[PDB]
Design a protein around this nucleic acid. Structure first.
Ligand SMILES: [Mg+2]
Ligand SMILES: [Mg+2]
Ligand SMILES: [Mg+2]
Ligand SMILES: [Mg+2]
Ligand SMILES: [Mg+2]
Ligand SMILES: [Mg+2]
Ligand SMILES: [Mg+2]
Ligand SMILES: [Mg+2]
Ligand SMILES: [Mg+2]
Ligand SMILES: [Mg+2]
Ligand SMILES: [Mg+2]
Ligand SMILES: [Mg+2]
Ligand SMILES: [Mg+2]
Ligand SMILES: [Mg+2]
Ligand SMILES: [Mg+2]
Ligand SMILES: [Mg+2]
Ligand SMILES: [Mg+2]
Ligand SMILES: [Mg+2]
Ligand SMILES: [Mg+2]
Ligand SMILES: [Mg+2]
Ligand SMILES: [Mg+2]
Ligand SMILES: [Mg+2]
Ligand SMILES: [Mg+2]
Ligand SMILES: [Mg+2]
Ligand SMILES: [Mg+2]
Ligand SMILES: [Mg+2]
Ligand SMILES: [Mg+2]
Ligand SMILES: [Mg+2]
Ligand SMILES: [Mg+2]
Ligand SMILES: [Mg+2]
Ligand SMILES: [Zn+2]
Lengths: 153, 394, 57, 60, 15
RNA sequence: UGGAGCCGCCGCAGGUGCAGAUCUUGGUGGUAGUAGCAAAUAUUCAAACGAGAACUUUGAAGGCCGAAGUGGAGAAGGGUU
RNA sequence: CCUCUGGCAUGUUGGAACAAUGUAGGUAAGGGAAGUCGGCAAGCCGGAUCCGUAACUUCGGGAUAAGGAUUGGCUCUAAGG
RNA sequence: GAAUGGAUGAACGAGAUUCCCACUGUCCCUACCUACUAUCCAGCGAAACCACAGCCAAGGGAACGGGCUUGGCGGAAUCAG
RNA sequence: UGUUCACCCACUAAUAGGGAACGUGAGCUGGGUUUAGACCGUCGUGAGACAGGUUAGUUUUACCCUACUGAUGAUGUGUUGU
């Protein structure tokens, strides 16, 4: 398919996406901004720190109610969280990009995550029973994720 | 309509933004006025609240019903090991304010002190004042220093001495000594500056600064009590049992029409860890620390002319949540601000002290040294041993 | 203790649903349903209140 | 792996609760291919599945 | 929609 | 971009022009990663299976229901659970 | 209220803290309803044995009126078939 | 005001009042403790409401302005309250 | 006394008067007014009425903005600390 933002030199840039993934759009969005522009071997490390709460993902845009944490000072921000699922999903995406770069014949440890993009995917829905016999929505908000690595070292 | 039944308001507005104090060590907000006539002296000291105890004394205010009667009186011990002067610092009067003009530091500075200049010491290479101390051993540097003092002698008006604690000598956990500016008050600026120059890299004990039966002002941060409701923080009324949405509240914040809640209305927030300057705390006893001539001189602390035992102001089982007061200490009447272990600024009075109570000379007849860590009943261990006799652990 | 259940679909204790305990050879207490109590015939004369002799009730 | 069927049957064979059924946790795989009863009755005789004793409630 | 008030509550009652 | 029909002029005809109607139907926001997932004491250790275990299973321990039972059986109702 | 038989996994989740407000429980020096529309709320009282029991009364009641005392553990004695 | 029943009245009342005894955090006057929350995190995740929005003083004005006039002034993004 | 108001006791230095949507119900309370049940009196043929008396009678929502309270932070100063 067509990704948004096609790479500068396709010869030496691997690609990946994952459509319609059950992961909180907002959380995922933020962890993708943190990861953006890292060297791939840093990025995997960082997401694993996020899984174990050794480094945070600052929630900048979608930050309402989100708590403060010391770990966010690194980023120049007060909010921050440890969205574990979001890490877990775009650890797999990296894994697949690293796979593709290897298949294409690129130096895997020269790949900088050039472009990453989280888009909203069509919502699921299940319902929640409420007071005075009302029934409201209780909807999942899943995302499409997609990204591009590039040989830069 | 008007409030029916008048009552004065809760809490003072002269104490607010009831917020968490930005400092920890309490700032001397205003040192006394130097009358250029009496001889030079330090104005302030920097101690540590060790704990509390009783005193007993005969009282001599004629007229009272307590004249020539023995009373008891709570006291704080403030362990105050001697301060090392490490810098001086000149100030110049301006119409803007009181600009700091020139800071000269000493040649040698302790690791006690250096500690303070780093947020992490373990991690650091401890390179502070390395290129500075070079100045004290050459022609160019020594000449540059001498000009800087001579400039301070010319242009500056106020001179403060930078002194720091000897954290080494305390039972506390921290090694990071507190620095502090202390105002030298006395004769002409030159004479003042020569005195400070002479005191550089030197100890300054408490007894130099303060004498006995002297009123002083304690300055420190309050014991902090976290987020606290309006009923704790302002001592407003509790609402009655029936109130549906809680009763530890203020009911009416404000009227309708200045349609904004005022800064004068009681809200919940930080209670404690405020900066505070108490005044008129009479020093009952400046004490001597432990010292040696052949064996220890532990007596010289809590022994009096009328008791003559061999006690230390240390109670049985030490001061609680503190340690052994081994060093020189003052002994203030009453309580003082802050928790145990809390660094505490003592300051000579801003005030001409000529009251019958403020000129009373204190002779202590008995200092209580009984355990605080539970209901203590023996002053000293040797006394307990005699009373009890032998125990099964013998 | 061995508690037990009805053996029929009739749950309610009724004139019909009268029972008794029996220990079996298997060494378990079990319900057997009882027959109703038959009455000996009364006299035709209609005055003598007792019921007749020599007749299986 | 999963021995809820075995524990049910066992108890019906023993005529106990299934509080009382004990399955040897070492010899699990053998128990897991027991499916039927009479396979279970074999296991009982070998001493893999056992009836536990009553929890003592003294009258003393 | 939400319940809000009882039938005989009639919120802003000004008789 | 898309992939099969469409327009100018002269006349005729109309279910002919939307910002509103607490309008109708459909969709999407901010609120918000917020409120919330707080009734009825309670969980812990090991192993197994397994890609993966706070939650499955087995074992061990600690707890509750405490025969007016959170036990064992039925009625009605359900209809393959 | 505690237990066995039998049955459960704490009632649609977990972890880390122990701030304010709350919900539900407790305790309070001295005073003792001064609180409030109002003793609302909570607290006192409580079981049994042995005493003792007023006004009034439709003579039945009132009546557990009110008001007192005792109560454990152990070792015996006597009395009942 | 007299079976639109008048007057009475033991017993009874989750009925309406008043006082006394006792008892008590109802109060003087509040404090401390416990559990479940709120709090922070993983996972999951609603709603109402919404012209645009959101600092004040005074003025005038449909005679009580967030917006207009004249002044005071104004500093990202947020957390618990 | 639901009261505002009133009066009286007691203390006091004094027991001055008022305003803020007759300040203040997403602050409470609900005693009173002011639904529905009922009682009495007066009025009405009657249904019913009564600034005439009586008793019983559901007090919702804040997580939005602002304001205020506290809490992180912000631009500047090359960075950082004092
Ligand atoms: Mg619900
Ligand atoms: Mg329903
Ligand atoms: Mg007034
Ligand atoms: Mg209420
Ligand atoms: Mg103590
Ligand atoms: Mg039948
Ligand atoms: Mg076609
Ligand atoms: Mg048409
Ligand atoms: Mg439209
Ligand atoms: Mg939440
Ligand atoms: Mg129970
Ligand atoms: Mg069954
Ligand atoms: Mg059942
Ligand atoms: Mg529970
Ligand atoms: Mg659970
Ligand atoms: Mg359930
Ligand atoms: Mg009390
Ligand atoms: Mg009163
Ligand atoms: Mg009263
Ligand atoms: Mg009551
Ligand atoms: Mg009586
Ligand atoms: Mg009449
Ligand atoms: Mg009449
Ligand atoms: Mg407006
Ligand atoms: Mg009003
Ligand atoms: Mg209001
Ligand atoms: Mg209200
Ligand atoms: Mg009422
Ligand atoms: Mg009515
Ligand atoms: Mg919240
Ligand atoms: Zn006959």
């Amino acid at each position: 398919v067509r990704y948004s933002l096609d790479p500068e030199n396709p010869t030496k840039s691997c690609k990946s996406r994952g459509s319609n993934l059950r992961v909180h759009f907002k959380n995922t969005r933020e962890t993708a901004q943190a990861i953006k522009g890292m060297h791939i071997r840093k990025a995997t490390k960082y997401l694993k720190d996020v899984t174990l709460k050794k480094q945070c993902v600052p929630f900048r845009r979608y930050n309402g109610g989100v708590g403060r944490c010391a770990q966010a000072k690194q980023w120049g921000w007060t909010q921050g969280r440890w969205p574990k699922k979001s890490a877990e999903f775009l650890l797999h995406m990296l894994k697949n990009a690293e796979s593709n770069a290897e298949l294409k014949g690129l130096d895997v440890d020269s790949l900088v995550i050039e472009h990453i993009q989280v888009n909203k995917a069509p919502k699921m829905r299940r319902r929640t029973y409420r007071a005075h016999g009302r029934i409201n929505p209780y909807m999942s908000s899943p995302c499409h994720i997609e990204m591009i690595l590039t040989e830069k070292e | 309509s008007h409030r029916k039944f008048s009552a004065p308001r809760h809490g003072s507005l002269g104490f607010l933004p009831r917020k968490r104090s930005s400092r920890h060590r309490g700032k001397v907000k205003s040192f006394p006025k130097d009358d250029p006539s009496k001889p030079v002296h330090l104005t302030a000291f920097l101690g540590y609240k060790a704990g509390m105890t009783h005193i007993v004394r005969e009282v001599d205010r004629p007229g009272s019903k307590v004249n020539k009667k023995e009373v008891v009186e709570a006291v704080t011990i403030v362990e105050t090991p001697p301060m090392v002067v490490v810098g001086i610092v000149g100030y110049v009067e301006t119409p803007r304010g009181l600009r700091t003009f020139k800071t000269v530091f000493a040649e040698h500075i302790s690791d006690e002190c250096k500690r303070r200049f780093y947020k992490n010491w373990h991690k650091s290479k401890k390179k502070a004042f390395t290129k500075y101390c070079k100045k004290w051993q050459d022609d160019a540097g020594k000449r540059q220093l001498d000009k800087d003092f001579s400039s301070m002698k010319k242009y500056c008006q106020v001179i403060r001495v930078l002194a720091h604690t000897q954290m080494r000598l305390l039972p506390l956990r921290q090694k990071k000594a507190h620095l502090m500016e202390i105002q030298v008050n006395g004769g002409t600026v030159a004479e003042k500056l020569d005195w400070a120059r002479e005191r550089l890299e030197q100890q300054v004990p408490v007894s130099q600064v303060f004498g006995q039966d002297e009123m002083i002002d304690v300055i420190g941060v309050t014991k902090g009590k976290g987020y606290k409701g309006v009923t704790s923080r302002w001592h407003t009324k509790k609402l009655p049992r029936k109130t549906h949405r809680g009763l530890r509240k203020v009911a009416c914040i404000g009227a309708w029409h200045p349609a904004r809640v005022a800064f004068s209305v009681a809200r919940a927030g930080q209670k404690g860890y405020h900066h505070r300057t108490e005044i008129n705390k009479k020093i009952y006893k400046i004490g001597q620390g432990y010292l040696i001539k052949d064996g220890k001189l532990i007596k010289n602390n809590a022994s009096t002319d009328y008791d003559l035992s061999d006690k230390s102001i240390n109670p049985l089982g030490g001061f609680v949540h503190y340690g052994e007061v081994t060093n020189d200490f003052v002994m203030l009447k009453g309580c003082v601000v802050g928790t145990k272990k809390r660094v505490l600024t003592l300051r000579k009075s801003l005030l001409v002290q000529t009251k019958r109570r403020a000129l009373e000379k204190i002779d202590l007849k008995f200092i209580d040294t009984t355990s605080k860590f539970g209901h203590g009943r023996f002053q000293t261990v040797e006394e307990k041993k005699a009373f009890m006799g032998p125990l099964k652990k013998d | 203790v061995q508690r037990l259940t009805y053996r029929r679909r009739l749950s309610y204790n009724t004139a019909s649903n009268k029972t008794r305990l029996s220990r079996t050879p298997g060494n378990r207490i079990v319900y057997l349903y009882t027959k109703k109590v038959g009455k000996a015939p009364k006299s035709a004369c209609g005055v003598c209140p007792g019921r007749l002799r020599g007749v299986r009730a | 792996s999963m021995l809820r069927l075995q524990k049910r049957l066992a108890s019906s064979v023993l005529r106990c609760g299934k509080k009382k059924v004990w399955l040897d946790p070492n010899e699990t795989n053998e128990i897991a291919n027991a499916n039927s009863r009479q396979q279970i009755r074999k296991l009982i005789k070998d001493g893999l599945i056992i009836r536990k004793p009553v929890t003592v409630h003294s009258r003393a | 929609g939400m319940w809000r008030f009882y039938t005989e509550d009639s919120p802003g009652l000004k008789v």
